[PDB]
């Protein structure tokens, strides 16, 4: 049926890399492809065929593993809240900045528009952190800014009449759910050269764009936990638009909410004793 | 026939250079006004025209032997200047592009190379989160302390991904960049957010054919382009 | 109910799964997409942009100066300016460039690379330079006589400030390994050598700077690609960021 | 696709209501490298001298 | 096939918000859109374009998250009966008034016609309420008014020949089932200005509309429980018709079966010291 | 339209919180009212129909209108300035500063009521309803509404020297909400019995 | 041309006002008879016509300085009045709409504002569940004790969602509301259930150009509209 | 719907017999705001004076 | 149908009045932009649009028993206000018309009449040539000392030749005048020359139905209309 045709999108990865045309020797004063001028800011236009004698090469290699979708389109850890047994409650602030691998991958772009698939793995363990048996339901509640936060395991906030929740078992399959692009802005921002507030220039609000922050995930067990639970929160970025590539992060990350780095030794690649030998 | 000779006429103002390289147009995107499909603010914008879309010259900088570089936030650097500055002060939100022209002449008896970066959303840090006098330095601009890290934990070497030109003294005395508006929203406040940073970083140091080092200034000239303003109220000068 | 047989792989979570999954906010209607300049659809658009090699990686050089290879007036003929093992992996100068940092995220590479050099001496400073690419099998070329036997360009300093040496894809196989993993003998994928030589000399008028610089720049050609994502070696953490 | 060479051909079937539920997009989209490599007002053809 | 076409309904959320037309200045005595009269009971008709000079804005925002279906169309807690080990039996009286979030959401309307999806999560715990292991079937029996109630875990009422029952496992997936609009009336009533009975005006039967009450859910374990079981009963309202919007509840709820409130301090929003400063 | 709980001064209880005082002034250009434009928080807009709906949502967009009704005697005259100041600074301090913004000027007469349309003036397509501090949702500051005497309230001898404005608020047809969220002030400590 | 002048003629009765605002027609729905598709009761209804569809005037109320407000249940308030009252007493079930007219004149030397609410299904409470003398107060009506909470834990400010008018003494002396039948069933008992509540609440207090406070009454006039009755038996007056 | 903008387009497929089993309805239904905002016998056009 | 009710919308600003007389359009000439045939200055004008073409309210004046009158020079009075003020400061020459609205309400228990003159080229004198504080009094305006002679050796009685309205308190509470640009040249400096004077002169004194005299302010609201500016330089505020 055509109605089911609406739920199917045929999508194709068949873009190839550029090929090579055979070329011959050139002795002239007409064509000088090797002479360049980096001052313009343009990258060199010279190609293989104009610099040496080439054979013909039919293109066969795909480019799809470096499409922005493929590069971001896998799951990565973004949150690891620990539910202790004293209160049986925990939360994770929602952003991709606690764990460095996804953050550094995002640092190649300025603005990014995407959806998210979240995946939550819960693991129970003892005080000495050895795996242990515990079968219990847990509740993950999305708490958006301005909604009252639960303060206990039995708080009546966990009613969840308006906050969305997911209920799953600690020893069941992983909870998984998708999320549309939720920013009030038309993209997310990986970096922000401004202040979070008018009438304020506190350093702690520099580089803080609050339209990236959609709130909190809160976690309880539905009864009081017998053992601590660790939730691992994975995000896969999908349906991805990217704008304005950047110099990628090179210094290690130090803080969650700013770009501070050490910068004690100004170098990235390793040293050698002489430029004319390895 | 000659991309070494240029003339830039905006408003009542005209720049010339006899040693340009070319003109960099960032992302191949000439500045353009906001279309009805992307716009959100319902009030009718003020478009000041030539009163603001004109070249403004900042104070010059001496290129010294030890210079690490200089930077300016936009619109920050022009927020107190002319009718651009006044339109930016009197409105809540602003949008527009830039025409940037960096001047530095020296002799055929000099050597040295400047890198001229226009960096969008150039959030900066060092070993510490920066204060307001560095995030929004005004018309006088700021200076780099970690030019190798591009003040941001990235690297200067990879900043050629950003729109740029060089000033290599053997070749040219000026760099020109045309910048479109870049943001994740249609308009944004001029006092709270800097959409672009103009960064001028020495890569090859300045050397003279004698040991006596005359004064070689760097001079920045910036024209706003295709500007709109919405949200008229009293004039507010800074985010402090 | 429809009879079924769940098989192996039931209830597993694979990080590269391509599956639809229920939306926790099925009534949400996002903000429109607006025009933004510089949309990127494929990271090989970035890899084709030139970036500066951290080429002056000599012990003791710090900061911006690591980006300028010294070039001097020579007192002897046919001297060497620079030497560089052609490698997208490892930790040498190519590893910190745009192409090198992308290669840190990938396991395999193919295609031609180009190196653009810009001279920074005074207008009055002259010189000719030989830039050589030696296919693998042996060592770095020891003298300009040996290096010239390979692919090479000869650069005349002049009004056009810059030159390109195109390092063409010359290879037994369709792809090479990015890394030089020793236990796995990925030196099998050795990709050759780049060396720079004085073709004549750097010559100056009396009392000019007797030392100038080359800024080396590198980028991928349009015939280039990467395979197999992999973790970046030098982007680590010992603790959760707070 | 039971295989052409480097052509992955996929029928993305979304079972849920919201487009955000769909799996990741496998299309190759247009590449315009020249907005980043040749970002200059005057085109410089390969065989010409760049300056002047 | 067309027969399977009967089981598919293509349904679309593409209603947009109103746009904006550009306007210019007006100097006249003809058109006075800003002059109003609130005495009529009509809301102001003045629009943006007639009050200031506007630009043109193409509408892009949807309205679907405030459709009555979307606003009610999620699950909320409505019942939390506890099955003790002494009798292994419990029940929940069926109405959406024990837990305040759903009740307050319903208080925006007078009459509501809907279906219900019920979801039941069972959790076992110790006397000190710590999660514990217990695998057992439980039985939820719908007991409508006039059907005899079970008095024990082994009562022969649990035969369930005519009452519908659901059997599920305490440590299995949650039981879930749908329910059509069951009122004898043509809608449910959120508020009732009348008496439950003729020939009676007892205050305890004021505001009681017994056509909202469809009876009881009764709960046992199929054997005698070793640990207490807590059932959490969630309801999602769907296929929703709503009539006659109301002033929503503002004072906290106090009782299950009437609108009594404290009303000690007559205010809702917070105070300030002066009307001309914040 | 619904009535703003606009007279939220400490000590005013009950129905009187719905009438902003307006008096005969002995000085020129005085201020009648000041209000931070906010759908969230706990100020006067939060208890209205629009404000109580906003309690269930996280984000908002669109134009809002405020309709004011004067309640003085037939013989009581006056002119009032109603101002909307886009964000970036503080509340306007005097009528000279407030008039620089969007504003209407209200003449008391037969048509009892006026509308100040607060138009959607915004860097982004949507704002955050809440003012969540830890998350810096003050980023979404939406400006100011102030009311001023444009001339004065004038009365015949021995009339009431104080009258009232009843403020009313509603959304325009270009308005919407996103992201359901729990209502802050609808709580319980126990199951209802 | 003038919505300040109105005339309402039902039966043998006619109202006029020279200061109306307009006429509120609740939910834009004029009262209408029950269609065969929604009806359930199989007996043929009695439709009394003009004998009951006519204006009835209740006793007037003094507007005092301290007045919190007044309220009447419908049909409750008219259940002992005229042939409406008799038809409602003699039948088990009843349906119909209302034409409500609130009168209050004062001078151009007075100020004050009444809110005139028609509230459907107005179930009331306070700190306690109310007794019969408040839930069904009869022709004399009841008084508010929590006018801020609208006797029901909601708020007076948000009750403009209900059909309403104002009586603002500078503008008008009368409010008119036309109410359709509202219920979740087709017909319902007149003695057991009140479909509408007429509520008149002072918002701006009553002030006079002197300190001597003459008598200013409020007067309610209500006409049933499009009435039907089914289930004829003996006459039953109240649910007690 | 593999995407138009703010158009969610859903094929609700009910697997059970009773219509009550079906998932929630995603249609946008007609809005008549004027039964609540303009509930008056005589229409008052925006440009007119309301009273008289 | 009613020239007693008016609404004036310019920019983000809207005025209303329920007691207007009509609108005076001086010499029947709506403000209009300068045509290429009459223009002399060759640079492209800045037209700020809504940023300046909007109503500005000056500080109010008390109408006292002894008041002789008040006056404001234009553009003088608005030269330090808003984006009009800034565009006038930053340009050598300016042209444009005005929308003037004078407000003064009182009671049906008051009497008194204001004359509202817009006087073009109103050069003033008395027994002495006036100082700068009277020729260009700014936003606060000046006061008459010879209201009978119209400060200029002419007569107030004959000033009805100028565009005018009355505010007669028994009739209206507001006067509206639309003024075209008037000059003998196409454009002229805003700081050196005043093209119009707004003059408000009491003719019948202000009388109250008691001896206790409450405060009756006069309030001026002025919108520039169809403005152009040429000759961009630094901002210059006054001719001193
Ligand atoms: C739990 C359902 C709603 C949660 C919304 C999650 C959306 C996450 C997007 C994060 C984008 C910003 C990333 C960052 O700031 O580093
Ligand atoms: C339950 C309905 C069954 C429909 C699923 C049919 C199989 C999925 C289509 C996969 C299309 C791409 C596969 C491929 O050719 O590589
Ligand atoms: C267990 C199967 C039959 C149960 C029927 C449940 C239907 C519940 C509808 C409740 C509607 C009234 C809500 C209320 O009174 O507050
Ligand atoms: C087992 C029979 C398979 C039929 C299900 C096909 C997929 C469900 C249709 C979903 C339609 C809406 C999806 C969308 O376009 O957003």
XYZ file of N, CA and C in Angstrom, chain I residues 34 38-41 74-76 79 84 87-96 98 121 136 181-196 227-231 233 239:
138
model
N 11.863 63.684 -0.277
C 12.427 64.660 -1.200
C 12.656 64.056 -2.588
N 14.146 68.292 -6.783
C 14.441 69.351 -5.827
C 15.711 69.099 -5.017
N 16.230 67.875 -4.987
C 17.380 67.560 -4.145
C 18.689 68.118 -4.713
N 19.591 68.494 -3.819
C 20.909 68.988 -4.207
C 22.055 68.131 -3.681
N 21.972 67.649 -2.447
C 23.048 66.874 -1.846
C 23.201 65.520 -2.545
N 11.130 72.369 16.947
C 11.372 71.126 16.271
C 12.353 71.346 15.129
N 13.299 70.430 14.916
C 13.518 69.173 15.635
C 14.146 69.338 16.999
N 14.555 70.557 17.344
C 15.240 70.844 18.601
C 14.794 69.989 19.791
N 16.054 66.406 19.589
C 17.408 66.179 19.083
C 18.241 65.296 20.009
N 15.821 58.926 16.454
C 15.725 60.233 15.811
C 16.853 61.138 16.267
N 20.223 60.000 14.804
C 20.372 60.277 13.382
C 20.531 61.769 13.132
N 19.858 62.600 13.928
C 20.004 64.038 13.774
C 21.368 64.521 14.255
N 21.930 63.875 15.276
C 23.257 64.246 15.763
C 24.354 63.854 14.784
N 24.233 62.698 14.142
C 25.311 62.173 13.319
C 25.318 62.695 11.884
N 24.312 63.442 11.459
C 24.259 63.971 10.106
C 24.298 65.490 10.102
N 24.906 66.037 9.053
C 24.943 67.478 8.858
C 23.558 68.043 8.565
N 22.760 67.354 7.772
C 21.478 67.886 7.355
C 20.422 66.801 7.466
N 19.200 67.269 7.638
C 18.027 66.506 8.003
C 16.818 67.130 7.325
N 15.834 66.297 7.034
C 14.531 66.746 6.580
C 13.463 65.783 7.084
N 12.295 66.317 7.424
C 11.141 65.484 7.719
C 9.940 66.207 8.289
N 6.195 66.011 10.868
C 5.842 65.695 12.245
C 4.398 65.234 12.358
N 8.810 78.502 11.112
C 9.827 79.563 11.192
C 9.514 80.570 12.287
N 16.329 77.755 21.643
C 16.435 76.307 21.485
C 16.333 75.674 22.867
N 7.298 68.964 6.092
C 8.518 69.763 6.126
C 8.278 71.129 5.484
N 8.705 72.193 6.152
C 8.668 73.519 5.547
C 10.034 74.176 5.684
N 10.563 74.670 4.572
C 11.840 75.369 4.527
C 11.952 76.033 3.168
N 12.896 76.951 3.059
C 13.213 77.541 1.773
C 14.303 76.772 1.029
N 14.886 75.744 1.640
C 15.868 74.878 0.978
C 15.419 73.422 1.107
N 16.025 72.445 0.379
C 15.562 71.051 0.491
C 15.809 70.378 1.842
N 17.020 70.466 2.376
C 17.354 69.946 3.693
C 18.002 71.070 4.482
N 18.138 70.874 5.788
C 18.755 71.882 6.631
C 19.203 71.206 7.922
N 20.146 71.844 8.608
C 20.715 71.320 9.844
C 19.706 71.304 10.984
N 19.660 70.183 11.712
C 18.760 70.042 12.859
C 19.196 70.866 14.070
N 20.496 71.120 14.251
C 20.966 71.858 15.420
C 21.034 73.364 15.201
N 20.963 73.822 13.974
C 21.143 75.233 13.720
C 19.839 75.955 13.440
N 18.786 75.236 13.070
C 17.552 75.811 12.561
C 16.359 74.996 13.045
N 15.310 75.684 13.483
C 14.052 75.056 13.878
C 12.985 75.384 12.847
N 12.492 74.360 12.159
C 11.520 74.567 11.091
C 10.109 74.837 11.629
N 9.736 74.232 12.749
C 8.416 74.397 13.344
C 8.557 74.694 14.825
N 11.517 60.804 7.316
C 12.773 61.474 7.593
C 13.875 60.988 6.662
N 14.770 61.905 6.323
C 16.005 61.638 5.608
C 17.127 62.418 6.268
N 18.346 61.899 6.141
C 19.549 62.517 6.675
C 20.685 62.364 5.682
N 21.445 63.423 5.496
C 22.607 63.401 4.633
C 23.772 64.036 5.366
N 24.971 63.779 4.872
C 26.143 64.363 5.481
C 26.577 63.682 6.756
N 28.869 62.387 9.574
C 30.153 62.609 10.233
C 30.009 62.145 11.679
N 24.365 73.390 18.609
C 25.027 74.454 17.864
C 25.958 75.291 18.722
